[PDB]
Amino acid sequence: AVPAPNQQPEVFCNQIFINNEWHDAVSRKTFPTVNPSTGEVICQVAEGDKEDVDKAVKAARAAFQLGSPWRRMDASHRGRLLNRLADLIERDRTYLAALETLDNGKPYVISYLVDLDMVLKCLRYYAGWADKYHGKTIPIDGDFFSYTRHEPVGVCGQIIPWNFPLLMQAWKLGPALATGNVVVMKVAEQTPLTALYVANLIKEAGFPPGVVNIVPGFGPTAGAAIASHEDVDKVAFTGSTEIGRVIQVAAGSSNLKRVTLELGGKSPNIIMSDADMDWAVEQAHFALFFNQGQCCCAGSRTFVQEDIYDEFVERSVARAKSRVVGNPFDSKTEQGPQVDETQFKKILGYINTGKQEGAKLLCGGGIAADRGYFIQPTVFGDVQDGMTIAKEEIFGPVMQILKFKTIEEVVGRANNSTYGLAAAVFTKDLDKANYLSQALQAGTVWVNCYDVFGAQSPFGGYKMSGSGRELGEYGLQAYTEVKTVTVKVPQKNS
Amino acid sequence: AVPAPNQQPEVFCNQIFINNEWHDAVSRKTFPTVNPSTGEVICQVAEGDKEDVDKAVKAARAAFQLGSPWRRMDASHRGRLLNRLADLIERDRTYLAALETLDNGKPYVISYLVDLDMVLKCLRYYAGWADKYHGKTIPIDGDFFSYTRHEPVGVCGQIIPWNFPLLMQAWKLGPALATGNVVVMKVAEQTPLTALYVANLIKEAGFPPGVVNIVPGFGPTAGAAIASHEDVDKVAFTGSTEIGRVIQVAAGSSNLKRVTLELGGKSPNIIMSDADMDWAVEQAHFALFFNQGQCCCAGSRTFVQEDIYDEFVERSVARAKSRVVGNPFDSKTEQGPQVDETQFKKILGYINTGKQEGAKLLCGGGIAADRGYFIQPTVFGDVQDGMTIAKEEIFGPVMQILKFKTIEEVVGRANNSTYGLAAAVFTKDLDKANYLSQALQAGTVWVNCYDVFGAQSPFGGYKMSGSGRELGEYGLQAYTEVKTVTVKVPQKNS
Ligand SMILES: *CCC(=O)c1ccc(CC)cc1
Ligand SMILES: *CCC(=O)c1ccc(CC)cc1
Ligand code: NA
Ligand code: NA
C-alpha cells in the first residue's frame, strides 16, 4: 500500500537556511530547478555563493560556542531531537516522497517505500547513538588517571549529490548531530527542494538556531567555498572521483580540515555457475538499473561464468526489455528519467562508445521518449575489460555483461580497477563465497544479494572510491575529535 | 642506574633498506650526517630519491599480495615478531642509546632511560594488539548476516622527524605492523642511523622481506615521492605544519591515499595560584626544556596567575640558571646541543626577535659553547599574546612566561591559536581542573603533570596540529580498511 501521491506538490521552501530562518542570496540571484520528466522548471531557488557560506559558517560557529544551548544539551536530548525530526519526516512522508520524485525523477513508489523508509531508519538509528559513543579510561603506567573525551570535531561542511537527495542528507546529518557537531550543508543544484523542506522540519523539531544550515547553490561556487573555508573543521563530500580530489587539495591548501569522501565505483557483480539462475538474473538487473542506474555502487560489470553465460544473457535481455519506462508518478513505472540534461547526454555518449568499440548491443541503446530525460534500458554483451564501458562509471541504465572461466581469473579482473566501492558474489557454495568475499578489494561485498544497506552496517570505498565509512558505529569516527586527559594522582592501584 | 656508554659507537648501517637487503642509492649519491655535539661528520648515508622510493614501494606491494607470507601469517604471530624485535632492541639497548645521542644530541642517560624504554613499551604494547582488533557482527534489518572485516590499509608511507628518532619509528611501526600493513619509511636526514640499525634487527627478528623498507634521503625528494606515489595507500607524516599541507595536497593530487598528520604546536601550560609551587616550577621547567626544547608539545606558553607570577618567575630563573649544559655523554648533562646548524640559528633569531619586540629577557640568551650547537637555557618574562615568540613554534630552550588574572580569561588566550596539540593545568582545585580540561582545545591535556605519555593513551592534534591519533586502540584506526560483508540467509533470528 502506497498512499496516492500529489503529482504536483506545492513548493514551500526555496531559500538559504540559516539560524532557523530563510534568506535570499546576498546577490538576490536565483537558479531554476527542473522537473526531469517534463524538462520544465519547478521553481527558482536562492543561489548561494561564498558570502552566503560565510554567513552559514559564522552561524554554525556561534552555535558551537562553549556554553551555547547545543553544546550544553544532554547527549540523550540530541537523541530526542533526532527522533522528533524523524517523526516529522514520517508525518510528511507522502509529500516528501512526491517532492523527491518531482525534482529527481525516481519512481514515487520507490521514493516512498525505499528512500523515505531509509531516511527514517537512518535518523532513528543515529538518535540511538547520541549518548552511547563512550570515551575510555586507560590503564597507563605510573600514578596517573588517563581517559579520553569524544568531542565533536565542530563545524562540518557537508556536500551532497543528487542521486539520493533526502537519504544522503540523512546519512550526513544523523552522525554529525548525534555527536554534537554543527553543519553547513551544500545540496545539489539538481535536487535542492527536499533538503530545504527538511530544514523546516529541523526548525520545527526544535533544533537550536545555527546547528543546521543549508546553502543551495552551484559547485564551483558554494561547494568550493565550504571546502576552502578557514573556519570549517571537517568536510564530507559525496560525488564524482574527479571532484573528490579537488576537495582534498582544497582541504590541504586551506586549514588542514579533516576529509572523508564517498566517490564513484565500477562495481563487479560475479555470477558463479552454481548460482540460483532466477534469483541471480533478477538481482543483477536490480544491481544495475536501480535508481535509473544512478548509484555509486551500481553493479556495472556483470561477470558471468561461461557455462551459464548464454542463458543468463538471454534472461537478462528479456528482463531489460520488459522494464517499464515512463511517468515516475505512475504506479506501473519502474524507471523514471535521468536527473538532468548533462547526465542524459553523458549517457548517450557512453552508449555511442559502447557501440564504437565493438560491444554487442542487445537491447535499448537510445532515447526512450520525446520529452524528458528518458533512456532505454540498455544491455551490452561480450564486454571486454579494455573497453571504455568496462572502465568508466556511466551512471545510467546501461548494463555490461562479461564472460569468465575461473574463480582465480575473475578475482584478478574484478580487482583490476582504481575503484573499490562494492562487489557481489552469487553462488551456492560456502567455500567459493568465503574465498571471494575475502579476495575482492571492495568496501562492501554482497553475497547472493545486492544493494542491501542497513543503518547498522558501514559503507564506503577502497582505493579511489573514497576514504572513511558512513553508517553503523564507524560513521561516528569522522565526527569525533578525541581528547586525552591525563591527571597526576596520589598512588595508582589496579 | 645506567650502563656506561661507548661514546664512539661503530656505525654498521648507512644504506637504503629494501627487501631485507642493503642497497646504495640508484644514483650512487650519499650524504653526510653530523654529530651536533662537535659539528663533525659521523659518516655518509645513501641519498634516496624518487627511483629508490619506487623500488621500495614495489617491494612493499609484493610483500602485500594476497597469499604471501605476511598476508597469510597468523595475527598472533605478527605479535610474536613485534615482541622479538623489542627483545632485540633490549639486547642492544646500550649501543642504540649511545648511537641516538651521537646523531641527535640528546643526553645519553635520557636516551637510555626514556627514549629506549618508551620504544620497548610501544612495540610491546602494539604486539598485544595484533590479534585483538576485532571487526563486528551486525544486526542489520532483514534476512541477512552482516559483518565487518578489519583488513590492513596496504602500503603505508611513513615520514618521521629528527627529535625522537627511535621513538617516532616505533610509534609508526607498532600500529602499522600490528595490523598487517607494509611500510615504506623515510627517516630524517639529521638522524638516519638509529632507524637503519633497527632495520637490521627487523631482518634479524624474521619479518618477511618487503614488509618494512627504509629509504633515507631529503624531504623534497624522498618524502615527496612517497606522498605522491600512485601505489601508496596511506601516508603518515610527522614534522612541521608547513610540510603537512604539502602532504595532504599531494595525496589529493595523486591517488586519494588516506592521510594522518602530527604537526607543530604552541602548547599552553597554565599555572593557577592554588598550585603546588615547587612542583609547578619544576614541571614547567621540564615541560619547556625537555629534549633541548625539541618537542612538538613543548609547554612554550607558560601562563601564570598574577598573584604568584612574581615568585614563580623568580623560581624558574634559578632553575633555568642551574640547568647543566654540556657533553650529552656525561651523566651530569641535562641539555645537549640542538640537532643541527639550521635549527641552531633559527633559535638565535627567535631570541633576537624576542628582545627586539619587548619581552623581558631574564637569563641566558646566547650561545653556550664554542664547539657544537649548544644554546643557553633562555627565559623571557612579561610576554604578550601578540609577540612572535608567543605565536610561533621555536623548538628550542626558550621559555615564555605570560600573566593572566582569571580562569575565563586564560581559556580564551590559551585557545587563541591555530595550534591544538597539548595543554596543561596546575591547580589543587577539583572544579578548576575539570573546567579547564574540558575547555582547552587540545589533543592532550595534562593535570598537575607534563609530557606524560603512555603507549595506551592516544596522542594527536586539534586544529592545525594535525589529525588522527597515534597510540592506544585509536592508533589502529588509520591502519585498518573496513570491509562490510552482507550475506543473504534463509531466515534471520535474534
Ligand atoms: C553512494 C550511495 C548509493 O549510491 C546508494 C545505492 C543504493 C542505495 C539503496 C539501494 C543507497 C545508496
Ligand atoms: C610529537 C612527539 C613529541 O614531541 C614527544 C615529546 C615527549 C615525549 C616523551 C616525554 C615523546 C614524544
Ligand atoms: Na531537479
Ligand atoms: Na645527526
PDB file of N, CA and C in Angstrom, chain A residues 138 146 148-151 245 248 252 254-256 258 263 437-438 440 442-448 456-458 461-464 466 469 474 481-486 488, chain B residues 138 140 146 148-151 245 249 252 254-256 258 263 437-438 440 443-448 454 456-458 461-464 466 469 474 481-486 488:
ATOM      1  N   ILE A 138      41.923   4.579  30.789  1.00  0.00           N
ATOM      2  CA  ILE A 138      43.074   3.908  30.181  1.00  0.00           C
ATOM      3  C   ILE A 138      44.089   3.582  31.258  1.00  0.00           C
ATOM      4  N   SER A 146      44.150   8.420  33.371  1.00  0.00           N
ATOM      5  CA  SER A 146      44.102   8.895  31.994  1.00  0.00           C
ATOM      6  C   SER A 146      42.807   8.411  31.324  1.00  0.00           C
ATOM      7  N   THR A 148      39.829   9.490  27.841  1.00  0.00           N
ATOM      8  CA  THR A 148      39.568  10.280  26.659  1.00  0.00           C
ATOM      9  C   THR A 148      38.134  10.821  26.665  1.00  0.00           C
ATOM     10  N   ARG A 149      37.970  11.975  26.043  1.00  0.00           N
ATOM     11  CA  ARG A 149      36.649  12.549  25.811  1.00  0.00           C
ATOM     12  C   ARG A 149      36.448  12.439  24.308  1.00  0.00           C
ATOM     13  N   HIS A 150      35.286  11.959  23.886  1.00  0.00           N
ATOM     14  CA  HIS A 150      34.944  12.020  22.468  1.00  0.00           C
ATOM     15  C   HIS A 150      34.171  13.304  22.220  1.00  0.00           C
ATOM     16  N   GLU A 151      34.872  14.329  21.745  1.00  0.00           N
ATOM     17  CA  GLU A 151      34.278  15.629  21.497  1.00  0.00           C
ATOM     18  C   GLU A 151      33.876  15.777  20.023  1.00  0.00           C
ATOM     19  N   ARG A 245      38.959  14.831  -5.512  1.00  0.00           N
ATOM     20  CA  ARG A 245      40.356  15.276  -5.453  1.00  0.00           C
ATOM     21  C   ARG A 245      40.474  16.786  -5.252  1.00  0.00           C
ATOM     22  N   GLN A 248      39.935  17.451  -1.649  1.00  0.00           N
ATOM     23  CA  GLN A 248      41.083  17.043  -0.832  1.00  0.00           C
ATOM     24  C   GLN A 248      42.250  18.022  -0.920  1.00  0.00           C
ATOM     25  N   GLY A 252      43.760  20.542   2.050  1.00  0.00           N
ATOM     26  CA  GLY A 252      45.199  20.649   2.308  1.00  0.00           C
ATOM     27  C   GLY A 252      45.762  22.054   2.109  1.00  0.00           C
ATOM     28  N   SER A 254      43.946  24.890   2.522  1.00  0.00           N
ATOM     29  CA  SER A 254      43.281  25.841   3.419  1.00  0.00           C
ATOM     30  C   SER A 254      43.720  25.679   4.885  1.00  0.00           C
ATOM     31  N   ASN A 255      42.940  24.946   5.678  1.00  0.00           N
ATOM     32  CA  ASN A 255      43.204  24.829   7.111  1.00  0.00           C
ATOM     33  C   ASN A 255      43.485  23.408   7.611  1.00  0.00           C
ATOM     34  N   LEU A 256      43.837  22.504   6.696  1.00  0.00           N
ATOM     35  CA  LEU A 256      44.058  21.100   7.071  1.00  0.00           C
ATOM     36  C   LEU A 256      42.830  20.529   7.795  1.00  0.00           C
ATOM     37  N   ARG A 258      39.714  17.963   8.343  1.00  0.00           N
ATOM     38  CA  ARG A 258      39.524  16.524   8.158  1.00  0.00           C
ATOM     39  C   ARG A 258      38.630  16.271   6.937  1.00  0.00           C
ATOM     40  N   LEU A 263      32.936   8.286  -3.197  1.00  0.00           N
ATOM     41  CA  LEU A 263      33.133   8.621  -4.609  1.00  0.00           C
ATOM     42  C   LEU A 263      32.552   7.570  -5.566  1.00  0.00           C
ATOM     43  N   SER A 437      34.626 -13.241  -1.010  1.00  0.00           N
ATOM     44  CA  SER A 437      34.401 -12.084  -0.149  1.00  0.00           C
ATOM     45  C   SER A 437      35.701 -11.636   0.536  1.00  0.00           C
ATOM     46  N   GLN A 438      36.611 -12.578   0.792  1.00  0.00           N
ATOM     47  CA  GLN A 438      37.927 -12.187   1.271  1.00  0.00           C
ATOM     48  C   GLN A 438      38.798 -11.553   0.181  1.00  0.00           C
ATOM     49  N   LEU A 440      38.016 -10.059  -2.781  1.00  0.00           N
ATOM     50  CA  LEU A 440      37.545  -8.906  -3.535  1.00  0.00           C
ATOM     51  C   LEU A 440      37.946  -7.617  -2.831  1.00  0.00           C
ATOM     52  N   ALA A 442      36.985  -4.428  -2.087  1.00  0.00           N
ATOM     53  CA  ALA A 442      35.813  -3.590  -2.144  1.00  0.00           C
ATOM     54  C   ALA A 442      35.306  -3.296  -0.735  1.00  0.00           C
ATOM     55  N   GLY A 443      34.730  -2.111  -0.566  1.00  0.00           N
ATOM     56  CA  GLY A 443      34.280  -1.628   0.734  1.00  0.00           C
ATOM     57  C   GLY A 443      33.136  -2.461   1.242  1.00  0.00           C
ATOM     58  N   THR A 444      32.250  -2.851   0.326  1.00  0.00           N
ATOM     59  CA  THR A 444      31.168  -3.771   0.646  1.00  0.00           C
ATOM     60  C   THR A 444      31.140  -4.916  -0.355  1.00  0.00           C
ATOM     61  N   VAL A 445      31.046  -6.142   0.157  1.00  0.00           N
ATOM     62  CA  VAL A 445      30.794  -7.330  -0.663  1.00  0.00           C
ATOM     63  C   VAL A 445      29.452  -7.960  -0.305  1.00  0.00           C
ATOM     64  N   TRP A 446      28.535  -7.995  -1.263  1.00  0.00           N
ATOM     65  CA  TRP A 446      27.272  -8.674  -1.044  1.00  0.00           C
ATOM     66  C   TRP A 446      27.365 -10.127  -1.494  1.00  0.00           C
ATOM     67  N   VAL A 447      26.721 -11.019  -0.753  1.00  0.00           N
ATOM     68  CA  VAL A 447      26.723 -12.434  -1.138  1.00  0.00           C
ATOM     69  C   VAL A 447      25.293 -12.879  -1.384  1.00  0.00           C
ATOM     70  N   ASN A 448      25.017 -13.272  -2.631  1.00  0.00           N
ATOM     71  CA  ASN A 448      23.668 -13.601  -3.072  1.00  0.00           C
ATOM     72  C   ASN A 448      22.656 -12.502  -2.826  1.00  0.00           C
ATOM     73  N   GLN A 456      22.829   0.072  10.262  1.00  0.00           N
ATOM     74  CA  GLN A 456      23.758  -0.631  11.155  1.00  0.00           C
ATOM     75  C   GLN A 456      25.125  -0.982  10.532  1.00  0.00           C
ATOM     76  N   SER A 457      25.205  -1.116   9.213  1.00  0.00           N
ATOM     77  CA  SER A 457      26.421  -1.639   8.591  1.00  0.00           C
ATOM     78  C   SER A 457      27.154  -0.535   7.844  1.00  0.00           C
ATOM     79  N   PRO A 458      28.472  -0.400   8.067  1.00  0.00           N
ATOM     80  CA  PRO A 458      29.200   0.704   7.423  1.00  0.00           C
ATOM     81  C   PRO A 458      29.289   0.552   5.893  1.00  0.00           C
ATOM     82  N   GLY A 461      34.411   3.361   0.426  1.00  0.00           N
ATOM     83  CA  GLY A 461      35.262   2.821  -0.623  1.00  0.00           C
ATOM     84  C   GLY A 461      36.593   2.271  -0.161  1.00  0.00           C
ATOM     85  N   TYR A 462      37.120   1.334  -0.951  1.00  0.00           N
ATOM     86  CA  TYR A 462      38.555   1.084  -1.083  1.00  0.00           C
ATOM     87  C   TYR A 462      39.103   1.974  -2.190  1.00  0.00           C
ATOM     88  N   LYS A 463      40.405   2.227  -2.146  1.00  0.00           N
ATOM     89  CA  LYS A 463      41.099   2.743  -3.316  1.00  0.00           C
ATOM     90  C   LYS A 463      40.516   4.114  -3.633  1.00  0.00           C
ATOM     91  N   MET A 464      40.239   4.372  -4.909  1.00  0.00           N
ATOM     92  CA  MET A 464      39.739   5.687  -5.318  1.00  0.00           C
ATOM     93  C   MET A 464      38.219   5.840  -5.320  1.00  0.00           C
ATOM     94  N   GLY A 466      36.923   6.153  -2.416  1.00  0.00           N
ATOM     95  CA  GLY A 466      36.822   7.040  -1.255  1.00  0.00           C
ATOM     96  C   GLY A 466      37.656   6.646  -0.045  1.00  0.00           C
ATOM     97  N   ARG A 469      34.138   5.730   6.342  1.00  0.00           N
ATOM     98  CA  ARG A 469      32.926   4.936   6.221  1.00  0.00           C
ATOM     99  C   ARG A 469      31.748   5.724   6.788  1.00  0.00           C
ATOM    100  N   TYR A 474      30.972   2.932  12.917  1.00  0.00           N
ATOM    101  CA  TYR A 474      32.069   3.547  12.169  1.00  0.00           C
ATOM    102  C   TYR A 474      31.749   4.961  11.687  1.00  0.00           C
ATOM    103  N   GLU A 481      36.349  14.293  17.668  1.00  0.00           N
ATOM    104  CA  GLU A 481      37.744  14.604  17.978  1.00  0.00           C
ATOM    105  C   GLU A 481      38.068  14.023  19.353  1.00  0.00           C
ATOM    106  N   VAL A 482      39.177  13.295  19.452  1.00  0.00           N
ATOM    107  CA  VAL A 482      39.491  12.596  20.694  1.00  0.00           C
ATOM    108  C   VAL A 482      40.457  13.414  21.526  1.00  0.00           C
ATOM    109  N   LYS A 483      40.047  13.758  22.739  1.00  0.00           N
ATOM    110  CA  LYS A 483      40.912  14.449  23.689  1.00  0.00           C
ATOM    111  C   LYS A 483      41.346  13.472  24.781  1.00  0.00           C
ATOM    112  N   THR A 484      42.646  13.403  25.026  1.00  0.00           N
ATOM    113  CA  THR A 484      43.180  12.646  26.155  1.00  0.00           C
ATOM    114  C   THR A 484      43.415  13.564  27.361  1.00  0.00           C
ATOM    115  N   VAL A 485      42.872  13.192  28.516  1.00  0.00           N
ATOM    116  CA  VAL A 485      43.135  13.917  29.755  1.00  0.00           C
ATOM    117  C   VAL A 485      43.906  12.978  30.681  1.00  0.00           C
ATOM    118  N   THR A 486      45.062  13.444  31.143  1.00  0.00           N
ATOM    119  CA  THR A 486      45.948  12.630  31.980  1.00  0.00           C
ATOM    120  C   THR A 486      46.318  13.379  33.254  1.00  0.00           C
ATOM    121  N   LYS A 488      47.730  13.576  37.245  1.00  0.00           N
ATOM    122  CA  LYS A 488      48.536  13.046  38.337  1.00  0.00           C
ATOM    123  C   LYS A 488      47.655  12.680  39.527  1.00  0.00           C
TER     124      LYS A 488
ATOM    125  N   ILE B 138      26.826  -7.684  12.887  1.00  0.00           N
ATOM    126  CA  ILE B 138      25.910  -6.541  12.888  1.00  0.00           C
ATOM    127  C   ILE B 138      24.450  -6.945  12.636  1.00  0.00           C
ATOM    128  N   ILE B 140      21.650  -6.202  11.223  1.00  0.00           N
ATOM    129  CA  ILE B 140      21.002  -5.396  10.178  1.00  0.00           C
ATOM    130  C   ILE B 140      19.566  -5.900   9.979  1.00  0.00           C
ATOM    131  N   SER B 146      25.396  -9.916   8.435  1.00  0.00           N
ATOM    132  CA  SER B 146      26.301  -8.834   8.046  1.00  0.00           C
ATOM    133  C   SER B 146      27.463  -8.677   9.050  1.00  0.00           C
ATOM    134  N   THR B 148      31.842  -7.113   9.552  1.00  0.00           N
ATOM    135  CA  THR B 148      32.915  -6.323   9.014  1.00  0.00           C
ATOM    136  C   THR B 148      34.197  -7.089   9.208  1.00  0.00           C
ATOM    137  N   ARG B 149      35.070  -7.011   8.210  1.00  0.00           N
ATOM    138  CA  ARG B 149      36.470  -7.373   8.356  1.00  0.00           C
ATOM    139  C   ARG B 149      37.324  -6.138   8.530  1.00  0.00           C
ATOM    140  N   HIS B 150      38.198  -6.163   9.521  1.00  0.00           N
ATOM    141  CA  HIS B 150      39.217  -5.136   9.613  1.00  0.00           C
ATOM    142  C   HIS B 150      40.458  -5.618   8.864  1.00  0.00           C
ATOM    143  N   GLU B 151      40.620  -5.147   7.631  1.00  0.00           N
ATOM    144  CA  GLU B 151      41.750  -5.500   6.776  1.00  0.00           C
ATOM    145  C   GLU B 151      42.808  -4.414   6.885  1.00  0.00           C
ATOM    146  N   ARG B 245      50.833  20.459   4.886  1.00  0.00           N
ATOM    147  CA  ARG B 245      49.952  20.914   3.797  1.00  0.00           C
ATOM    148  C   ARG B 245      50.367  20.307   2.460  1.00  0.00           C
ATOM    149  N   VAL B 249      47.912  17.880   0.061  1.00  0.00           N
ATOM    150  CA  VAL B 249      47.724  18.306  -1.332  1.00  0.00           C
ATOM    151  C   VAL B 249      48.207  17.207  -2.282  1.00  0.00           C
ATOM    152  N   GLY B 252      45.699  14.277  -2.427  1.00  0.00           N
ATOM    153  CA  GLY B 252      44.529  14.630  -3.226  1.00  0.00           C
ATOM    154  C   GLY B 252      44.880  14.806  -4.692  1.00  0.00           C
ATOM    155  N   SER B 254      47.294  13.029  -6.155  1.00  0.00           N
ATOM    156  CA  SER B 254      47.680  11.701  -6.646  1.00  0.00           C
ATOM    157  C   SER B 254      46.511  10.709  -6.626  1.00  0.00           C
ATOM    158  N   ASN B 255      46.520   9.775  -5.678  1.00  0.00           N
ATOM    159  CA  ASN B 255      45.617   8.632  -5.723  1.00  0.00           C
ATOM    160  C   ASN B 255      44.546   8.649  -4.624  1.00  0.00           C
ATOM    161  N   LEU B 256      44.383   9.793  -3.958  1.00  0.00           N
ATOM    162  CA  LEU B 256      43.487   9.906  -2.792  1.00  0.00           C
ATOM    163  C   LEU B 256      43.871   8.945  -1.659  1.00  0.00           C
ATOM    164  N   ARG B 258      44.851   7.680   1.942  1.00  0.00           N
ATOM    165  CA  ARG B 258      44.448   8.121   3.275  1.00  0.00           C
ATOM    166  C   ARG B 258      45.618   8.869   3.924  1.00  0.00           C
ATOM    167  N   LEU B 263      51.635  17.395  13.556  1.00  0.00           N
ATOM    168  CA  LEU B 263      52.383  18.606  13.207  1.00  0.00           C
ATOM    169  C   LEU B 263      52.882  19.387  14.438  1.00  0.00           C
ATOM    170  N   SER B 437      40.148  21.319  31.751  1.00  0.00           N
ATOM    171  CA  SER B 437      40.448  20.193  30.863  1.00  0.00           C
ATOM    172  C   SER B 437      39.362  20.075  29.802  1.00  0.00           C
ATOM    173  N   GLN B 438      38.128  20.419  30.164  1.00  0.00           N
ATOM    174  CA  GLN B 438      37.021  20.438  29.210  1.00  0.00           C
ATOM    175  C   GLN B 438      37.223  21.557  28.196  1.00  0.00           C
ATOM    176  N   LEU B 440      39.885  23.561  27.306  1.00  0.00           N
ATOM    177  CA  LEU B 440      41.080  23.729  26.480  1.00  0.00           C
ATOM    178  C   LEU B 440      40.930  22.956  25.192  1.00  0.00           C
ATOM    179  N   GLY B 443      44.687  18.219  22.036  1.00  0.00           N
ATOM    180  CA  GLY B 443      44.586  16.771  21.902  1.00  0.00           C
ATOM    181  C   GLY B 443      44.859  16.029  23.200  1.00  0.00           C
ATOM    182  N   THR B 444      45.818  16.547  23.967  1.00  0.00           N
ATOM    183  CA  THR B 444      46.169  16.015  25.284  1.00  0.00           C
ATOM    184  C   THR B 444      46.178  17.188  26.267  1.00  0.00           C
ATOM    185  N   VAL B 445      45.459  17.044  27.367  1.00  0.00           N
ATOM    186  CA  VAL B 445      45.528  17.986  28.468  1.00  0.00           C
ATOM    187  C   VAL B 445      46.087  17.275  29.702  1.00  0.00           C
ATOM    188  N   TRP B 446      47.238  17.718  30.199  1.00  0.00           N
ATOM    189  CA  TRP B 446      47.771  17.177  31.458  1.00  0.00           C
ATOM    190  C   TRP B 446      47.306  17.989  32.667  1.00  0.00           C
ATOM    191  N   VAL B 447      46.994  17.299  33.764  1.00  0.00           N
ATOM    192  CA  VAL B 447      46.672  17.954  35.016  1.00  0.00           C
ATOM    193  C   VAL B 447      47.698  17.643  36.098  1.00  0.00           C
ATOM    194  N   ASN B 448      48.407  18.679  36.522  1.00  0.00           N
ATOM    195  CA  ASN B 448      49.441  18.558  37.554  1.00  0.00           C
ATOM    196  C   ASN B 448      50.613  17.703  37.127  1.00  0.00           C
ATOM    197  N   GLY B 454      51.543   7.497  27.468  1.00  0.00           N
ATOM    198  CA  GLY B 454      51.519   6.051  27.653  1.00  0.00           C
ATOM    199  C   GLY B 454      51.304   5.446  26.295  1.00  0.00           C
ATOM    200  N   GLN B 456      49.394   3.286  25.882  1.00  0.00           N
ATOM    201  CA  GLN B 456      47.952   3.033  25.964  1.00  0.00           C
ATOM    202  C   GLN B 456      47.075   4.263  25.624  1.00  0.00           C
ATOM    203  N   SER B 457      47.640   5.465  25.727  1.00  0.00           N
ATOM    204  CA  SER B 457      46.863   6.703  25.587  1.00  0.00           C
ATOM    205  C   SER B 457      47.127   7.414  24.254  1.00  0.00           C
ATOM    206  N   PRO B 458      46.053   7.724  23.490  1.00  0.00           N
ATOM    207  CA  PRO B 458      46.249   8.289  22.165  1.00  0.00           C
ATOM    208  C   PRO B 458      46.740   9.735  22.263  1.00  0.00           C
ATOM    209  N   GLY B 461      46.718  15.958  17.237  1.00  0.00           N
ATOM    210  CA  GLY B 461      46.357  17.373  17.286  1.00  0.00           C
ATOM    211  C   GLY B 461      44.894  17.730  17.099  1.00  0.00           C
ATOM    212  N   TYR B 462      44.485  18.824  17.741  1.00  0.00           N
ATOM    213  CA  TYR B 462      43.339  19.627  17.312  1.00  0.00           C
ATOM    214  C   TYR B 462      43.797  20.642  16.255  1.00  0.00           C
ATOM    215  N   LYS B 463      42.832  21.197  15.519  1.00  0.00           N
ATOM    216  CA  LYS B 463      43.068  22.280  14.556  1.00  0.00           C
ATOM    217  C   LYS B 463      44.212  21.929  13.615  1.00  0.00           C
ATOM    218  N   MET B 464      45.215  22.799  13.536  1.00  0.00           N
ATOM    219  CA  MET B 464      46.322  22.582  12.605  1.00  0.00           C
ATOM    220  C   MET B 464      47.541  21.877  13.209  1.00  0.00           C
ATOM    221  N   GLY B 466      47.385  18.827  13.524  1.00  0.00           N
ATOM    222  CA  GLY B 466      47.312  17.586  12.756  1.00  0.00           C
ATOM    223  C   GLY B 466      45.924  16.972  12.769  1.00  0.00           C
ATOM    224  N   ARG B 469      44.928  10.014  15.460  1.00  0.00           N
ATOM    225  CA  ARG B 469      45.624   9.813  16.721  1.00  0.00           C
ATOM    226  C   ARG B 469      46.676   8.728  16.527  1.00  0.00           C
ATOM    227  N   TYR B 474      43.231   3.677  19.429  1.00  0.00           N
ATOM    228  CA  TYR B 474      42.849   4.601  18.363  1.00  0.00           C
ATOM    229  C   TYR B 474      43.929   4.637  17.277  1.00  0.00           C
ATOM    230  N   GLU B 481      41.429  -0.879   6.966  1.00  0.00           N
ATOM    231  CA  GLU B 481      40.380  -0.597   5.981  1.00  0.00           C
ATOM    232  C   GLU B 481      39.195  -1.518   6.266  1.00  0.00           C
ATOM    233  N   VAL B 482      38.005  -0.947   6.353  1.00  0.00           N
ATOM    234  CA  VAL B 482      36.890  -1.703   6.891  1.00  0.00           C
ATOM    235  C   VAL B 482      36.128  -2.268   5.695  1.00  0.00           C
ATOM    236  N   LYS B 483      36.005  -3.597   5.635  1.00  0.00           N
ATOM    237  CA  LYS B 483      35.141  -4.254   4.633  1.00  0.00           C
ATOM    238  C   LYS B 483      33.850  -4.757   5.260  1.00  0.00           C
ATOM    239  N   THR B 484      32.715  -4.361   4.697  1.00  0.00           N
ATOM    240  CA  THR B 484      31.444  -4.931   5.098  1.00  0.00           C
ATOM    241  C   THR B 484      31.095  -6.130   4.222  1.00  0.00           C
ATOM    242  N   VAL B 485      30.728  -7.242   4.847  1.00  0.00           N
ATOM    243  CA  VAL B 485      30.214  -8.382   4.099  1.00  0.00           C
ATOM    244  C   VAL B 485      28.783  -8.660   4.533  1.00  0.00           C
ATOM    245  N   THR B 486      27.874  -8.740   3.566  1.00  0.00           N
ATOM    246  CA  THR B 486      26.474  -8.862   3.882  1.00  0.00           C
ATOM    247  C   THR B 486      25.879  -9.987   3.063  1.00  0.00           C
ATOM    248  N   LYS B 488      22.972 -12.884   2.179  1.00  0.00           N
ATOM    249  CA  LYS B 488      21.615 -13.397   2.243  1.00  0.00           C
ATOM    250  C   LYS B 488      21.572 -14.734   2.986  1.00  0.00           C
TER     251      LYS B 488
END
